[PDB]
């Protein structure tokens, strides 16, 4: 699984950047994105996807184990709509 | 916040790091995440989220503009699952 460790190492052998800043950029990368989502801003990354924010209302739910119907509290989640470019590169993938 | 506005804000903060460096750095990271999902491997960033791959069974598609049945293959689709820290900070309604 791709981790921040592998991402930093990549920037070291592709951009020749020290692992230090290579590890600091990967952190600030996801950080800045999370700061935009929490602030209520859409994140549109061309050639990748789009992190949307939809306010879901309180809908009926339950306890998957027993079956006790419990109303799922409303909350703002963070969806991800992959671009057409990304889909065309993952359409022919393979779980490995 | 676009792919460009994302680099500008990060470059403004990090002054001890060339602006040009931050530009290519962001582009390489995205390309890396796009290539990983292309190979079949999944991504998992603690605190941010994770990018998995869900399978789609082949079905006789349709044309929502004309109404012609179009053949569709299996194909996979990128999926993102918000992390613990991501959901809490984003959710402004307890």
Residue numbers in the entry:
A (entry chain I): 2 to 97
B (entry chain J): 1 to 94
Authors' own words:
The site-specific recombinase (Int) encoded by bacteriophage λ is the archetypical member of the tyrosine recombinase family, whose members carry out such diverse functions as chromosome segregation, chromosome copy number control, gene expression, conjugative transposition, gene dissemination, and viral integration and excision. All tyrosine recombinases use the same isoenergetic phosphoryl transfer chemistry and sequential strand exchange mechanism to execute DNA rearrangements via the formation and resolution of a transient four-way DNA junction, or Holliday junction (HJ), recombination intermediate. Int is a heterobivalent DNA binding protein that binds to high affinity 'arm-type' DNA sites via its small amino-terminal domain (NTD) and more weakly to 'core-type' DNA sites, where DNA cleavage and ligation take place. The Int subunits within a recombinogenic complex bind and bridge arm- and core-type DNA sites in patterns determined by the accessory DNA bending proteins IHF, Xis, and Fis.
Using techniques described previously, we trapped and purified the multi-protein HJ complex of excisive recombination and determined its structure at 11 Å resolution using single particle electron cryo-microscopy (cryo-EM). At the center of the excisive complex an integrase tetramer is bound to a core-site HJ, where strand exchange has taken place between the B half-site of attL and the C half-site of attR. IHF heterodimers bend the P arm at the H2 site and the P' arm at the H' site, in each case re-directing the DNA back towards the Int tetramer. For P', the IHF bend is sufficient for the P'1 and P'2 arm-binding sites to be engaged by the Int subunits bound at the C' and B core sites, respectively. A sharp IHF (yellow) directed bend at the H2 site, combined with the cooperative binding and bending by three Xis molecules (gold) and the Int subunit bridging between the B' and P2 sites (magenta), redirects the P arm over the top of the Int tetramer. As a result of the IHF and Xis-induced bends, the P2 site is positioned where it can be engaged by the Int subunit bound to the B' core site. The EM structure reveals that Xis also mediates a substantial protein-protein interface between the P and P' arms. The Xis molecules bound at the X1 and X1.5 sites of the P arm are packed against the Int-B and Int-C' NTDs bound at the P'2 and P'1 sites, respectively. Instead, Xis-NTD, and possibly Xis-linker interactions provide the additional glue required to hold attL and attR together and allow the initial strand exchange to take place. The core HJ isomer that we fit in the EM structure corresponds to a bottom strand cleavage configuration, where the complex is poised to carry out strand exchange to form attP and attB products.
